[PDB]
């Protein structure tokens, strides 16, 4: 089939070994599904830290935006996956990326009560007065 589709499914399902195999077989790390979710989005939102790292090491676009305007960092922040937030920031995720409500990962983290995330985002330059 399409290796891209397979890589989307593997990243979602948290299949570490499948992700590596598919990447070695030339799967597009920047494949998108029908609502703009990339493997990085899917891994990030599902808490799959190992897969997030593998994707980033292979040059996955850290600021790809889905149909809502969510970057992987938005999704990680809203789900409370601290380690994934950290690694995304380390690969230069835009800490002030705006979704289509003009919300940044900090807004979303704060709204969901993920306060450890809020503090990390602040550490890496999140602007509380960021505005679209």
């Amino acid at each position: 089939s399409d290796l891209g589709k397979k890589l989307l499914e593997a990243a979602r399902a948290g299949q570490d070994d499948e992700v590596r195999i598919l990447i070695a077989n030339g799967a597009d790390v920047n494949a998108v599904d029908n609502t703009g979710l990339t493997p990085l989005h899917l891994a990030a939102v599902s808490g799959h830290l190992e897969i997030v790292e593998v994707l980033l090491k292979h040059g996955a676009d850290v600021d790809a935006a889905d149909v809502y305007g969510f970057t992987p960092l938005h999704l990680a922040a809203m789900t409370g996956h601290l380690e994934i937030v950290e690694v995304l920031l380390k690969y230069g995720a835009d800490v002030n990326a705006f979704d289509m409500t003009g919300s940044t990962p900090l807004h979303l983290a704060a709204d969901e009560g993920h306060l450890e995330i809020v503090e990390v985002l602040l550490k890496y330059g999140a602007d509380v007065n960021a505005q679209d």
Binding site: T35, L37, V45, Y68, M78, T79, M100, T101, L108, E112
Partner: protein, 289 residues
């Protein structure tokens, strides 16, 4: 041929800067537009007058506008005005920044029951308002149930809507093809408010089950199933919900709950309705209680 970069309403004096492209909405191109003064952002529907052949597309345009502009409710897309130049009709609507239940559905498939309950209640309240104002929507579907920043449902897209003008009026004509065809639309008998209850039935099924109730790979087989009322609710669906689906998805339109009776079903008056859906619910299932 070329859409103006700035939209000027002759009447109200309001001027709107054309922003990012949102997609086609039928014959219309849609854009984020922002008031130059107040800086409010709206969804602009821009229809070329070239595509408004006098038949079913034109008076349809007038009907959508006539009906929508007369509406104002918590669960109906805000109507903010309309105007025209020599080349285009411009409709200013509420921008619904969390897309529609279509996008949700594509990502989530089957929702949890509390989610379905949360969304369905708003859909029903919105539709009750329409029915009380003698409006049948006639084309309720995932793609025209928009969500705002608070994940409140807003009913949009009144392109197939009609106003019941007298009591017991049987509508015989639609200016297009509904997404969910009610059995009475397939028949010669005509139709009325119960077509929205049918579509809400289909929607509820889709939200809970994760696939449409009737649709197959062949339209003929689909239409045949509709007329024979052939569908199956999977056994994992809870009884109250299943029962409510069965009440809505009945061939005889008079046998279905009215929108008010629908609102007052056990499905809504019992069972959990979350105070809030977390924004994660657009992408992954949420945990409750």
């Amino acid at each position: 041929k070329e859409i103006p970069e700035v939209l000027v309403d002759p009447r109200s004096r309001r001027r709107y800067v054309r922003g990012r492209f949102l997609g086609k909405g039928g014959f219309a191109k849609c854009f984020e537009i922002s008031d130059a003064d107040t800086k409010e952002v709206f969804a602009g529907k821009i229809v070329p007058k070239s595509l408004l052949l006098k038949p079913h597309q034109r008076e349809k345009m007038s009907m959508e506008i006539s009906i929508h502009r007369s509406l104002a409710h918590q669960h109906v897309v805000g109507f903010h005005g309309f105007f025209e130049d020599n080349d285009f009709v411009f409709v200013v609507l509420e921008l619904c920044r969390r897309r529609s239940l279509l996008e949700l559905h594509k990502r989530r498939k089957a929702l949890t029951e509390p989610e379905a309950r949360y969304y369905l209640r708003q859909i029903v309240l919105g539709c009750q308002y329409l029915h009380r104002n003698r409006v049948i929507h006639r084309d309720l579907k995932l793609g025209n149930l928009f969500l705002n920043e608070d994940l409140e449902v807003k009913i949009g897209d009144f392109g197939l809507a009609t106003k019941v003008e007298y009591d017991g009026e049987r509508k015989k004509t639609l200016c297009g093809t509904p997404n969910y065809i009610a059995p009475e639309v397939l028949s010669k008998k005509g139709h009325s408010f119960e077509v929205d209850v049918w579509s809400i039935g289909c929607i509820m099924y889709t939200l809970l089950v994760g696939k449409p109730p009737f649709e197959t790979s062949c339209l003929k087989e689909t239409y045949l199933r509709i007329k024979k009322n052939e569908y199956s609710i999977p056994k994992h669906i809870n009884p109250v919900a299943a029962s409510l689906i069965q009440k809505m998805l009945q061939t005889d339109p008079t046998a279905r709950p009215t929108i008010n009776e629908l609102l007052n079903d056990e499905f809504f008056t019992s069972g959990y309705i979350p105070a809030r859906l977390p924004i994660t619910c657009l992408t992954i299932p949420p945990r409750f209680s």
